[PDB]
Amino acid sequence: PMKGRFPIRRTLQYLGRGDVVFKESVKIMTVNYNTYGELGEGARKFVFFNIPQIQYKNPWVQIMMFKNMTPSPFLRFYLDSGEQVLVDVETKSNKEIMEHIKKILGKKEETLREEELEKQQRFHPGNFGPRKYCLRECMCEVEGQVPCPGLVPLPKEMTGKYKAALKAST
Amino acid sequence: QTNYDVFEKTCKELGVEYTLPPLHFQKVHRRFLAKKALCIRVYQEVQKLKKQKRALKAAAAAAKK
Amino acid sequence: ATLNQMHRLGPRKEPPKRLGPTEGRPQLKGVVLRTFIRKPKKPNSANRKCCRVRLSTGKEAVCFIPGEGHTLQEHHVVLVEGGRTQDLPGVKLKVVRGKYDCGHVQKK
Amino acid sequence: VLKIRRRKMNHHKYRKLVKRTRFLRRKVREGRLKKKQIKFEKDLKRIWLKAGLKEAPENWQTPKIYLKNK
Amino acid sequence: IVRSSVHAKWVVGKVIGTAMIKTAKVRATRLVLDPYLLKYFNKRKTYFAHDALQQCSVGDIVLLRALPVPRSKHVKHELAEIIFKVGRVIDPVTGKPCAGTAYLESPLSEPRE
RNA sequence: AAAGGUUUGGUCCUGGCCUUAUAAUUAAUUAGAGGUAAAAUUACACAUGCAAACCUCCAUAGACCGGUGUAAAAUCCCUUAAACAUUUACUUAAAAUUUAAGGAGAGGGUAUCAAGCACAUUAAAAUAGCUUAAGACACCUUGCCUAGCCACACCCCCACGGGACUCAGCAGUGAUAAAUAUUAAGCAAUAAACGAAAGUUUGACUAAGUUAUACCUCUUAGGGUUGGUAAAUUUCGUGCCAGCCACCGCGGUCAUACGAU
RNA sequence: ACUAUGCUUAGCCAUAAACCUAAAUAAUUAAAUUUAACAAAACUAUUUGCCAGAGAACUACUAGCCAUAGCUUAAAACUCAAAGGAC
Ligand code: FES
Ligand SMILES: [K+]
Ligand SMILES: [K+]
Ligand SMILES: [K+]
Ligand SMILES: [K+]
Ligand SMILES: [K+]
Ligand SMILES: [K+]
Ligand SMILES: [Mg+2]
Ligand SMILES: [Mg+2]
Ligand SMILES: [Mg+2]
Ligand SMILES: [Mg+2]
Ligand SMILES: [Mg+2]
Ligand SMILES: [Mg+2]
Ligand SMILES: [Mg+2]
Ligand SMILES: [Mg+2]
Ligand SMILES: [Mg+2]
Ligand SMILES: [Mg+2]
Ligand SMILES: [Mg+2]
Ligand SMILES: [Mg+2]
Ligand SMILES: [Mg+2]
Ligand SMILES: [Mg+2]
Ligand SMILES: [Mg+2]
Ligand SMILES: [Mg+2]
Ligand SMILES: [Mg+2]
Ligand SMILES: [Mg+2]
Numbered sequence: 097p098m099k100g101r102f103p104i105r106r107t108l109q110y111l112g113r114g115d116v117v118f119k120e121s122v123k124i125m126t127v128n129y130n131t132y133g134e135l136g137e138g139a140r141k142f143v144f145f146n147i148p149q150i151q152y153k154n155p156w157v158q159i160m161m162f163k164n165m166t167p168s169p170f171l172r173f174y175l176d177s178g179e180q181v182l183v184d185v186e187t188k189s190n191k192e193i194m195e196h197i198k199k200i201l202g203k204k205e206e207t208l209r210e211e212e213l214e215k216q217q218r219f220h221p222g223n224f225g226p227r228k229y230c231l232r233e234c235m236c237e238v239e240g241q242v243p244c245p246g247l248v249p250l251p252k253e254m255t256g257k258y259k260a261a262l263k264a265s266t
Numbered sequence: 267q268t269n270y271d272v273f274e275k276t277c278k279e280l281g282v283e284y285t286l287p288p289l290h291f292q293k294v295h296r297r298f299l300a301k302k303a304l305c306i307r308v309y310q311e312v313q314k315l316k317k318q319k320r321a322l323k324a325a326a327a328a329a330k331k
Numbered sequence: 332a333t334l335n336q337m338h339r340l341g342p343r344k345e346p347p348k349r350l351g352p353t354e355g356r357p358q359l360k361g362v363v364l365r366t367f368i369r370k371p372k373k374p375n376s377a378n379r380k381c382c383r384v385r386l387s388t389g390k391e392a393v394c395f396i397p398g399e400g401h402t403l404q405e406h407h408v409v410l411v412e413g414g415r416t417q418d419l420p421g422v423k424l425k426v427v428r429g430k431y432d433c434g435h436v437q438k439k
Numbered sequence: 440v441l442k443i444r445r446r447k448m449n450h451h452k453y454r455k456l457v458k459r460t461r462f463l464r465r466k467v468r469e470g471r472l473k474k475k476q477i478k479f480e481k482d483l484k485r486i487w488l489k490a491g492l493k494e495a496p497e498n499w500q501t502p503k504i505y506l507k508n509k
Numbered sequence: 510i511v512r513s514s515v516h517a518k519w520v521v522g523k524v525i526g527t528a529m530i531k532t533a534k535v536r537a538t539r540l541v542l543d544p545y546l547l548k549y550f551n552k553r554k555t556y557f558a559h560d561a562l563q564q565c566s567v568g569d570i571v572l573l574r575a576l577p578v579p580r581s582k583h584v585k586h587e588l589a590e591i592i593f594k595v596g597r598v599i600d601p602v603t604g605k606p607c608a609g610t611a612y613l614e615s616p617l618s619e620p621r622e
Numbered sequence: 623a624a625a626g627g628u629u630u631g632g633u634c635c636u637g638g639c640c641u642u643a644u645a646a647u648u649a650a651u652u653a654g655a656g657g658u659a660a661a662a663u664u665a666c667a668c669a670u671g672c673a674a675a676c677c678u679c680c681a682u683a684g685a686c687c688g689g690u691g692u693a694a695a696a697u698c699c700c701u702u703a704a705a706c707a708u709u710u711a712c713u714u715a716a717a718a719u720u721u722a723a724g725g726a727g728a729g730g731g732u733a734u735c736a737a738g739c740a741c742a743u744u745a746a747a748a749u750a751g752c753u754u755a756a757g758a759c760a761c762c763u764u765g766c767c768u769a770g771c772c773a774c775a776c777c778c779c780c781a782c783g784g785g786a787c788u789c790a791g792c793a794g795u796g797a798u799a800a801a802u803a804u805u806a807a808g809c810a811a812u813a814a815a816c817g818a819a820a821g822u823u824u825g826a827c828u829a830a831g832u833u834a835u836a837c838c839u840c841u842u843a844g845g846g847u848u849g850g851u852a853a854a855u856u857u858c859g860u861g862c863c864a865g866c867c868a869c870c871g872c873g874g875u876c877a878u879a880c881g882a883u
Numbered sequence: 884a885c886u887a888u889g890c891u892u893a894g895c896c897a898u899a900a901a902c903c904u905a906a907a908u909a910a911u912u913a914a915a916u917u918u919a920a921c922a923a924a925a926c927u928a929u930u931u932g933c934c935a936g937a938g939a940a941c942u943a944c945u946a947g948c949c950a951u952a953g954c955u956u957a958a959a960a961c962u963c964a965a966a967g968g969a970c
C-alpha cells in the first residue's frame with residue numbers, strides 16, 4: 097500500500113492530467129488559504145489536489161502558500177510586467193478555481209499545439225543515425241538497398257580483397 | 267504575528283522583553299568557546315592594522331599635496 | 332518511515348563491496364613457499380593438501396591444491412583462483428591444475 | 440536467555456581486563472589528553488598566522504582546557 | 510533598461526533577518542518534485558535584497574525585484590513590495606485590517622480613518 | 623521473480639546466505655572454413671622507422687585529425703553579455719564557433735568531518751555581520767553529460783624558470799600483469815591542409831593481416847554433469863583414508879555424492 | 884561482633900528489567916479483521932525518532948562531560964549459515 101492519503105496524487109498520470117499551462121507572463125502564484133473554516137473548503141482542496149498539477153506543468157513558476165493569515169482564501173498572481181492579479185476563491189469549488197485561473201491566465205489549446213509541432217521540427221524520418229534520434233541507423237536496413245555485409249556476405253567482385261587480387265594479377 | 271500593535275503595548279506595559287528565536291542553534295563547549303574568542307580577536311587585530319595603515323597612507327598623500 | 336523521512340534520507344546507504352583473496356581479479360600468480368597439511372573441521376576427517384604462496388600482489392596466502400596427488404615443491408610457480416574450501420577455515424584460494432608448474436592430475 | 444548471559448560474560452571479562460591494566464590506561468589517557476591539547480594549540484596558531492598576524496592577539500594565552508583544572 | 514540575467518526576476522519570500530545595513534535577508538521557497546516519491550517538497554533559497562528605507566521586519570512577506578546590475582556579491586535584488594507586514598496584515602479582498610482569520614475592523618463598517 | 627534450497631524434536635514466525643536468468647574478462651580442455659564487429663594489464667621506461675605540409679618567394683596550415691582518462695565532486699540544464707585565432711554577405715548582418723560573468727532546478731561517499739574563522743553589508747567609509755544538522759567546513763573516491771562532451775599532452779596543478787628531459791600518434795620493444803593485433807599496403811573513396819587551378823600531402827581514413835571475444839552462414843564434435851535444490855549412473859576399487867561440495871552435505875565394508883568404468 | 888553505607892547540610896555522578904518490554908494525538912468497531920502465535924481485540928490517519936542477519940561489540944578509536952578502573956556517542960577486520968521469536 098502506497099503511503100499517505102490519496103496516493104494517486106503521487107503518480108505521473110495524475111500530475112499530467114493538469115490542464116492549466118500559464119502564460120509566459122505568470123511568474124509567481126501565492127496561495128492564501130485557511131486550514132479551519134467552512135467557506136474555505138474549496139481552497140483547502142485546491143491546495144491538496146490541484147497545486148501539484150499546476151506546478152508539474154509550470155515548473156518555473158514559484159508557488160508559495162501561506163496559511164491562516166487572512167479571514168478569506170485568495171490567489172494572487174505576479175506577472176512579469178509588474179501587474180498583480182488577485183483572485184478570490186471563497187465559496188468556490190476546487191474545480192471552479194482551476195477553471196477560473198485557466199481562463200484568465202491559461203494558454204489556449206491552439207497555442208500549445210503550435211509549440212509541440214515547432215519542437216519536433218528537426219526530427220526527420222528520412223534521417224539516419226542512432227536509434228535514440230532516428231528510425232534507421234543505415235541504408236542497409238531499407239528494403240531493396242544493398243544489405244549489411246555482416247548479415248549477408250557481399251559478392252566477391254564487390255570486395256576490396258578481391259579487387260586487389262585482380263590488380264596484382266593484371 | 268497576528269496583532270503587532272497589541273503585542274507592542276503588552277510588552278511595554280508588562281515590561282517583558284521579547285527576543286526572536288535564533289535561526290541556527292549554536293553548540294557550546296570549552297574548545298569551541300576558546301577558538302571562537304580567538305577568531306574574533308584575530309579579526310579585530312587585522313582590521314585595526316588596516317585602519318592604521320589607511321591613516322598613515324592618507325597622511326603621507328596629504329603632505330605631498 | 333514517513334514520506335517526509337524517506338525524502339530527507341533518500342535511497343538506502345549501501346556498504347561497499349569489499350574484495351576477497353584475489354582482490355577482484357580472476358586469477359593470481361604466486362610462488363610456492365611451503366607445502367603442508369591442513370585438518371578439516373569436525374565432523375570432516377582428512378589430511379587436505381595445501382600450500383602457502385606469495386602472490387604477485389605481495390601478500391602471502393594459503394591455497395588448497397585440488398586433485399589426487401600433486402608434485403608441487405618450494406619455488407614452484409602456480410596460478411591461484413578464488414573459491415573457498417568449505418571444511419578448511421581460512422583457505423580462500425585454490426590452485427589451477429594444468430598451468431605453469433602445476434600439472435593435471437595424473438590419471439593412473 | 441544466552442544473550443544477556445553473554446553480555447554479562449562479555450562485560451565481566453572487560454571489567455577484569457580493565458582492572459589488570461588500569462595503571463597502563465591511566466598513562467595512556469594523560470598522554471592522549473596532552474596530544475589533544477597540543478593539537479588544540481596548533482590549530483589556534485594556524486588561524487592567526489594565516490590571517491597575517493605574526494604574534495598572537497595581545498593579552499591572549501591559549502586556555503588549558505584538557506588539564507586537571509576542575 | 511535591460512533586465513537582469515538572473516532567472517529570479519521576481520521572487521517572494523519571508524524576511525528571516527535584517528541585521529545588515531539597508532539589506533534584508535529573505536528566505537524564498539519553491540516546490541521541487543521528488544522523482545522517487547513523485548511528491549512536492551519545499552526547497553528554500555536565501556536572497557539578499559536592498560532595503561533602502563530599512564522598512565522591513567522579520568517575518569513579513571515581501572516581493573523582490575531583480576536589480577539590473579548586482580549591487581554586491583550577494584545583493585542582486587531590491588525590495589519591490591511588502592505583501593504582508595508582520596502582525597499588521599491588511600486583507601487584500603476586503604481591505605480591512607485583520608489579525609489572523611478574523612477582522613480587526615468589520616467589512617460592513619466604513620470607518621475611513 | 624511465478625520462485626526455490628537451507629535454523630527445529632516438531633510447527634509457525636522472523637531473518638540472512640545460497641540456487642536458478644543475463645553479460646564481460648581471464649584460465650583449463652577442445653576446435654574447419656567463410657562474412658562482419660571489436661581489440662583493452664599498466665599516465666612505468668622506450669631502440670628504430672614513419673605520423674604536416676603546401677606554394678612563383680609573402681602568407682596559410684602544422685591550434686585540427688589521432689591518443690589517454692591525468693586532474694577534479696569535479697557537472698547537467700538554463701540566463702545575460704561580449705567576442706573569434708572564423709565563414710559568407712554588406713562595407714555592414716546572418717551564421718558557425720567560443721569566451722566571461724551568472725543561477726529556476728538537478729548533481730558520489732563519510733556527521734566518529736559539527737562547526738567554518740572573514741567566509742558580510744553599507745559606501746560620510748561606518749555596521750558586526752556571512753555559511754551551517756534543509757549538512758557549512760574538512761577529508762575520501764570517481765571522468766560524464768554519451769550523434770557526443772570534459773580534462774590532460776614527460777614531470778614540478780601552471781611552466782618565466784627548473785628537473786629525474788618526452789611514442790597517453792601508428793607499428794614495435796623492455797619491465798610489469800590472470801590479461802599478448804602488423805616494426806604491414808594505399809592516398810583509389812570520404813575527411814582535413816595548401817594552392818586561382820590542373821594537383822600535392824596525410825599511420826585521419828580506406829582495403830587488408832592477426833585473435834573463438836561477440837554476431838551471422840555452414841560443416842567436423844567436443845566440454846561438463848548425473849544425492850537434493852536441478853535434467854540424467856552400471857560395475858568395481860577405496861573404507862572418516864584418498865578425495866568431493868555453490869548451499870545442505872558425502873566417505874569408518876550393500877557409496878546413485880570420492881576414483882576408474 | 885563491627886565498618887563503609889543507608890540519615891542531615893552543601894555540591895558532584897547521570898546509571899536501572901529508568902518496564903505498562905505499549906511514542907504521542909484524533910478517530911472507527913465495520914470493513915464478512917484469530918490475519919501467525921503469544922501478550923494487551925483489531926485497525927486507519929498524522930508527525931517525529933529508530934531499525935536493516937548473527938557474533939566480534941554495553942568493544943576499539945573519536946568528540947563532549949566536575950565524570951580519571953566513569954558515562955554518552957560508536958565502527959572495522961575477522962568468523963559462521965545461521966542467530967532469534969512464539970508455540
Ligand atoms: S550496418 Fe549498414 S552496412 Fe552494416
Ligand atoms: K564427515
Ligand atoms: K529464506
Ligand atoms: K532458529
Ligand atoms: K598536468
Ligand atoms: K585520397
Ligand atoms: K563418472
Ligand atoms: Mg585468452
Ligand atoms: Mg578526437
Ligand atoms: Mg584519476
Ligand atoms: Mg572512530
Ligand atoms: Mg610516456
Ligand atoms: Mg603540464
Ligand atoms: Mg604505441
Ligand atoms: Mg608526441
Ligand atoms: Mg584480451
Ligand atoms: Mg581553397
Ligand atoms: Mg563399495
Ligand atoms: Mg553432485
Ligand atoms: Mg562418481
Ligand atoms: Mg555507621
Ligand atoms: Mg515491568
Ligand atoms: Mg552500561
Ligand atoms: Mg565504553
Ligand atoms: Mg571510548
Ligand SMILES: [Mg+2]
Nearest residue numbers: 346958959960
Ligand atoms: Mg559487518
